[PDB]
Design an enzyme around this catalytic site. Sequence first.
Site, PDB file in Angstrom:
ATOM      1  N   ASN A  29      41.266  32.873  30.903  1.00  0.00           N
ATOM      2  CA  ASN A  29      42.216  33.858  31.463  1.00  0.00           C
ATOM      3  C   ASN A  29      43.239  33.162  32.367  1.00  0.00           C
ATOM      4  O   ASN A  29      42.835  32.323  33.185  1.00  0.00           O
ATOM      5  CB  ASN A  29      41.440  34.905  32.289  1.00  0.00           C
ATOM      6  CG  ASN A  29      42.211  36.199  32.473  1.00  0.00           C
ATOM      7  OD1 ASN A  29      43.066  36.531  31.661  1.00  0.00           O
ATOM      8  ND2 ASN A  29      41.880  36.963  33.526  1.00  0.00           N
ATOM      9  N   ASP A  94      37.291  27.698  31.764  1.00  0.00           N
ATOM     10  CA  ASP A  94      37.314  29.102  32.233  1.00  0.00           C
ATOM     11  C   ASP A  94      36.396  29.980  31.346  1.00  0.00           C
ATOM     12  O   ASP A  94      35.258  29.579  31.052  1.00  0.00           O
ATOM     13  CB  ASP A  94      38.768  29.617  32.334  1.00  0.00           C
ATOM     14  CG  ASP A  94      38.882  30.978  33.029  1.00  0.00           C
ATOM     15  OD1 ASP A  94      38.761  31.040  34.273  1.00  0.00           O
ATOM     16  OD2 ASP A  94      39.118  31.980  32.322  1.00  0.00           O
ATOM     17  N   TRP A  95      36.871  31.149  30.908  1.00  0.00           N
ATOM     18  CA  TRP A  95      36.079  32.046  30.077  1.00  0.00           C
ATOM     19  C   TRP A  95      35.716  31.426  28.732  1.00  0.00           C
ATOM     20  O   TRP A  95      34.704  31.785  28.125  1.00  0.00           O
ATOM     21  CB  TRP A  95      36.769  33.407  29.925  1.00  0.00           C
ATOM     22  CG  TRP A  95      36.428  34.342  31.095  1.00  0.00           C
ATOM     23  CD1 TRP A  95      37.242  34.691  32.141  1.00  0.00           C
ATOM     24  CD2 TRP A  95      35.184  35.006  31.300  1.00  0.00           C
ATOM     25  NE1 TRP A  95      36.563  35.551  32.998  1.00  0.00           N
ATOM     26  CE2 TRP A  95      35.296  35.754  32.494  1.00  0.00           C
ATOM     27  CE3 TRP A  95      33.971  35.038  30.586  1.00  0.00           C
ATOM     28  CZ2 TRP A  95      34.257  36.544  32.976  1.00  0.00           C
ATOM     29  CZ3 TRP A  95      32.928  35.835  31.065  1.00  0.00           C
ATOM     30  CH2 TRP A  95      33.069  36.558  32.265  1.00  0.00           C
ATOM     31  N   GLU A 118      35.652  23.475  34.780  1.00  0.00           N
ATOM     32  CA  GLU A 118      35.991  24.704  35.506  1.00  0.00           C
ATOM     33  C   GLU A 118      35.304  25.918  34.860  1.00  0.00           C
ATOM     34  O   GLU A 118      35.940  26.874  34.390  1.00  0.00           O
ATOM     35  CB  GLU A 118      37.513  24.846  35.573  1.00  0.00           C
ATOM     36  CG  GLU A 118      38.102  23.995  36.684  1.00  0.00           C
ATOM     37  CD  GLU A 118      37.735  24.525  38.038  1.00  0.00           C
ATOM     38  OE1 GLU A 118      37.964  25.718  38.251  1.00  0.00           O
ATOM     39  OE2 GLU A 118      37.211  23.768  38.886  1.00  0.00           O
ATOM     40  N   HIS A 271      42.369  24.668  38.946  1.00  0.00           N
ATOM     41  CA  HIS A 271      41.636  25.408  37.922  1.00  0.00           C
ATOM     42  C   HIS A 271      42.067  25.048  36.504  1.00  0.00           C
ATOM     43  O   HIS A 271      41.234  24.761  35.628  1.00  0.00           O
ATOM     44  CB  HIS A 271      41.768  26.925  38.149  1.00  0.00           C
ATOM     45  CG  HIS A 271      40.900  27.734  37.232  1.00  0.00           C
ATOM     46  ND1 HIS A 271      39.542  27.531  37.129  1.00  0.00           N
ATOM     47  CD2 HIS A 271      41.200  28.716  36.352  1.00  0.00           C
ATOM     48  CE1 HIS A 271      39.040  28.369  36.239  1.00  0.00           C
ATOM     49  NE2 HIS A 271      40.026  29.100  35.755  1.00  0.00           N
TER      50      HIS A 271
HETATM   51 CL    CL Z   1      38.926  36.048  35.167  1.00  0.00          CL
END
Ligand code: CL
Lengths: 298, 298
Positions: A29, A94-95, A118, A271
């Site tokens: 995201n 991330d996701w 991350e 990030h």
């Molecule tokens: Cl998120």
Amino acid sequence: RRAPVLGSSMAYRETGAQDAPVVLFLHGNPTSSHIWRNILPLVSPVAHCIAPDLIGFGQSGKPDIAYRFFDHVRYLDAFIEQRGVTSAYLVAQDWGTALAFHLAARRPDFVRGLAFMEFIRPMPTWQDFHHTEVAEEQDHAEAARAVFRKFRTPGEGEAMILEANAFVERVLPGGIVRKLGDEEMAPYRTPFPTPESRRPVLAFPRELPIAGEPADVYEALQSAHAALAASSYPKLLFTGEPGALVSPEFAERFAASLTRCALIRLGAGLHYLQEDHADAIGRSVAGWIAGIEAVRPQ
Amino acid sequence: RRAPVLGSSMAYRETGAQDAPVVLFLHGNPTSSHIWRNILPLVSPVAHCIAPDLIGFGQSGKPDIAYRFFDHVRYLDAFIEQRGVTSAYLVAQDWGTALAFHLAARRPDFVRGLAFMEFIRPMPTWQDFHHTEVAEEQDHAEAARAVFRKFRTPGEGEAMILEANAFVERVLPGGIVRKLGDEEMAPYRTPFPTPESRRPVLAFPRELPIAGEPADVYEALQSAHAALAASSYPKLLFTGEPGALVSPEFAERFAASLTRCALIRLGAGLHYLQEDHADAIGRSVAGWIAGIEAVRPQ
Ligand SMILES: [Cl-]
Ligand SMILES: [Cl-]
């Protein structure tokens, strides 16, 4: 490229040979396969690279679904099936990492290796979100907690993400050390021209496994992390300094806790590590695939 | 550090956990372990790094010997034995590659993998020295051949290399795309304060296997290349553009002729690729070792 998936479509970037091992690149995201643009060319010499846009992201379809974690699970699974990929390396942020971990937990034999950064883990308390223990990072960590608590609040989340487009306008550039050029930023904006288009971007922070909730995601990721800890396939963990979801001291401890996980330290990073460290990540992943393939079954 | 070797000593840089696999870094002419200084820290997290200074180079001893290729072989064997190293990855450039290929030909069980670049091969004719098929490179290649023919001429070589210090002062900076800072250049000069101390630097170009001569080195490197072409251990070949000893087109063809050899394109580069691509090389090697080590014994 485009693949029909569950009555909708998913866009994907593809490069490499044909008889090379597959590497799936999984974004999070609010990004898309765009984030891998400068990494793909470094991995293409050693692998058939496939970078899907998650449903509702990039150039993928925008069905009127809930966009929960398990929705992404289903659409990614259907994409893997549609493309005929029977095994792959996973490269994730991330996701993307939650999707990779859950995929590896259900299909241990599918995974050639996992390169990640991350990443998402179950977070018992809000202090575990952006947990770090060094200087002026705490200002940034606490603000990130405040922003994400608000993202998870009815009404407030809608105002920030759907209306003010804060994830694209603030959080994204906030997680990159360098300033993107206009031509680099534009493809991050183009998938999200309207409030309604931003529904998937608001759905994701409300899926983050924090303080036991949402319980279905929290439990699935506890399970996925148990499987990761017990897994035997090659792993590569990248970390920036200070990072965001993953601090260097935690990265060290986490990597050491796993079986066959190398830690790669990137230097100054937040990030969205791909945007600051495309060369270093690409070269590391490419060398890593080449080495595993040189000694693998044959 | 320093190790006693055959009545003299060899200096060496060492970094990394000593229960990790060993990686030996082998420099060539007219360099030392100095050339690996920006690569070591990137490989240290995954390997016990050992970078010796060849006898007569860097901070090593300056014994009263001929400094022929087989002198280097004997001193490097004796170093490895003194350090108690029983197997290693090899990372090598220039004459380092000749030592690596020759070690690998004699002791293939020692070699956990070989990462190499800008390597020496038997050259039937002088046109195979700095061989290029690219129109715009022909002038540069001819200029290179002209200087190395002079180095190999009795009397003239001594004037150029011992008296005028041309290998350090002209050839070295000539093979780097960037300009080294004064502080980075200084440690390339300090091993060679006098014409006498430059004897090993003059010995090397006279050892290059060209048109059959010297026959001992030519034959040994012919056998070593046949061994390399048949070898089954993991390999990485790095190339620059235009490169120097290895053109991009040749690298591609060469790598493809080998078994389990990945090709890593670095971009703009000449002969001393470490100085221009330390991060890319370090990141690639570290990834590669991490990958091989994850799948080894299991
Ligand atoms: Cl998120
Ligand atoms: Cl030489």
